[PDB]
Amino acid sequence: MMVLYSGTTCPFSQRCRLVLFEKGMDFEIRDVDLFNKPEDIAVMNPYGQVPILVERDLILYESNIINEYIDERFPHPQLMPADPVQRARARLFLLNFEKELFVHVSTLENEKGKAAEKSHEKARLAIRDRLTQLAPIFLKNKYMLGEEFSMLDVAIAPLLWRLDHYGIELSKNAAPLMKYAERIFSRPAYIEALTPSEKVMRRGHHHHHHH
C-alpha cells in the first residue's frame, strides 16, 4: 500500500498521480495544500516538496525518481521502454525536459511576488520556444515515442495542461503539439488522475474530455 503525498495543483505531483492511475495500482493519495504546507513534508523530504512516495520504510521524492520506481515494480503498462537502447534515449529526453522546460515550470510555481514577474515572463517565453520546437514531432507520432504511450508523455502532460493557466500562447505552427496534448488528455487514466481543482484550469472555450 503506497501513499503518495500530492499537491492538489502541483504539476510534478500530477505526473505521479497519472502513473498510478495508468497502472491501476493499490494506492492512497494524501492531498497536500501547498498554501498551508504541513511540517511533515519537510521531515520526509529535506527539500520540503511534493510529490513524496511512502511505502513501508521507503521514502522517495522527485517525480521522475518516484515514477521510475513504480514503473519497475508495476510494469503494466510499461512506461519506460524495455529495450536498453530505447530506454537510455528516453531517459535523455526526460533529462532534457527537466533542464529546458521544467526548471521554468518550477519558476512559475515557486517564485512569488512582483519581483518574480520578470522571471515568470522569461519562463513563459523559454517554455513557448522549446514547446514550439517539439511540435513537428507530433505530425507523424501519436505520442512522443511513436505509437506507445510512455513516461515522456507522462512527464510533459502537466505542462501542456497548464499552458492557459500559465499564460503561455503558442503560434499556429505548434498545432500538432496541441493535438498531441488532447490525445493524452483523452486517456481514461488522465481523466481520472486530474484533481477537481486541476479541471478548473481548462480554458473556458474548450470542453472537457469524458469517458
Add this chain to the structure above:
Amino acid sequence: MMVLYSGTTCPFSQRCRLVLFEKGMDFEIRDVDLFNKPEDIAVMNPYGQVPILVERDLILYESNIINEYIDERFPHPQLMPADPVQRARARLFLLNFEKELFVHVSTLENEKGKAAEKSHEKARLAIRDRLTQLAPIFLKNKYMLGEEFSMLDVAIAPLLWRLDHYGIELSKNAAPLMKYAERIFSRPAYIEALTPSEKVMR
C-alpha cells in the same frame, strides 16, 4: 564497438572512462580538445559538450546517462543495487549529488574570467560544506553504499581527485573522506582511466 568522446581533463568524462574500464569490454576513447572540437560534435550533442558515447546508431551524452546505459548493457560488475528499493534510493542520492556537488564542478570547469572568480569561490564553499557533511559516513563505510563499489563512488571520484586542483580546502573533519578517496583511486580501473594530464593534478 563503443566509442567515447572524452575530455582529457574533463571530470565528467573521467566518470565514463572509469565505468568503461570497470566493465572491461571493448571500447575506444577519442580525445576531444577545445579548438580541435570536430564539427560533428554538435550533431551528436547540441550542447556541444563531452562526454559523448556512440554505439552503432546510438548517441548519448550526460555522464550519468552514458554510465547508466553502460551499466545495463554490461551487467557485471553491477554499479547499482539489484534490489529495486535500494536502487531507487541510490538513484535519488545520485540526483541529489548533481544539485549539491556537480553544479559547482560545472561552474569551476566552464565559467571563465574575472567575472567568474566570485562564482568560483561560491562553488568552492558549497562543495566544502557538502563534503564536510558527507565525510563522517566513511568512518564506517568502505564505499558510499557500504561494502559494494557503485555509481555513487564513480560519480564523486573525479571531484575528490581534483580538490587541490580546484583550490578547495576541506575542514578538519574530512580525513575519513580522504581515506575513502584513496580506496577509489587504488582500484585498478581508476588507475587505467587516469589520463596523463589528470595524473599531474595530484
